[PDB]
């Protein structure tokens, strides 16, 4: 849908200009590994298509202060943060928030991967 298209437009445009990207997300205990996997798969897709270096960090659901500390201390031009709640004011990097409920986080990341490979074609 259009929101996914908007998200991948901004991620690709920002990554096209910047050099280092931080992809950070949060997951509940049972989904944390699958969410981290999806994030690494999106990271690899962006590295392969654009040539930008992408670091991945995963925190546990609700660890907003840990995420903010990671983001503020990251050497990154662009930050992509997927969470269910908007993060408060944080950073010199460009921040892109991806909003998604717990049960949708892997599906949203997978839709971004598929949108990026489609834009490549």
Overall strand count: 4
- Could you name the CATH topology? Rossmann fold
Count helical runs. 4
Question: In CATH terms, what is the architecture?
Answer: 3-Layer(aba) Sandwich
Distance separating the two termini: 18 Å
Give the amount of beta strand, in percent: 15-25%
| Number of spatially distinct domains | 1
CATH homologous superfamily descriptor: Diphthamide synthesis DPH1/DPH2 domain 1
Q: What's the arrangement of strands in the largest beta sheet? A: 2-1-3-4
Shape: globular
Helix content: 40-55%
Query: What structural category arises from helix and sheet content?
Result: alpha/beta
Please give the CATH class.
Answer: Alpha Beta
Characterize the largest beta sheet: strand count, sense, and whether it forms a barrel. Answer: 4 strands, parallel
Element pattern in H and E: HEHEHEEH
PDB class: de novo protein
Keywords: De novo design protein, DE novo protein
Assembly: monomeric
Entry title: De novo design protein -NX1
């Amino acid at each position: 849908g259009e929101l996914i298209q908007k998200y991948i437009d901004e991620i690709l445009a920002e990554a096209e200009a910047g050099k280092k990207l931080l992809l950070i997300g949060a997951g509940p205990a049972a989904a944390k590994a699958a969410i981290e996997e999806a994030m690494k798969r999106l990271a690899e897709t962006l590295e392969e298509l654009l040539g930008v270096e992408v670091k991945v960090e995963i925190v546990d659901d609700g660890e907003y202060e840990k995420a903010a500390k990671i983001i503020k201390e990251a050497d990154a031009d662009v930050v992509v943060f997927i969470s269910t709640k908007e993060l408060k004011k944080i950073t010199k990097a460009k921040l892109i928030n991806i909003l998604a409920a717990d049960a949708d986080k892997v599906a949203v990341l997978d839709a971004l991967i598929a949108a990026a490979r489609a834009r490549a074609l």
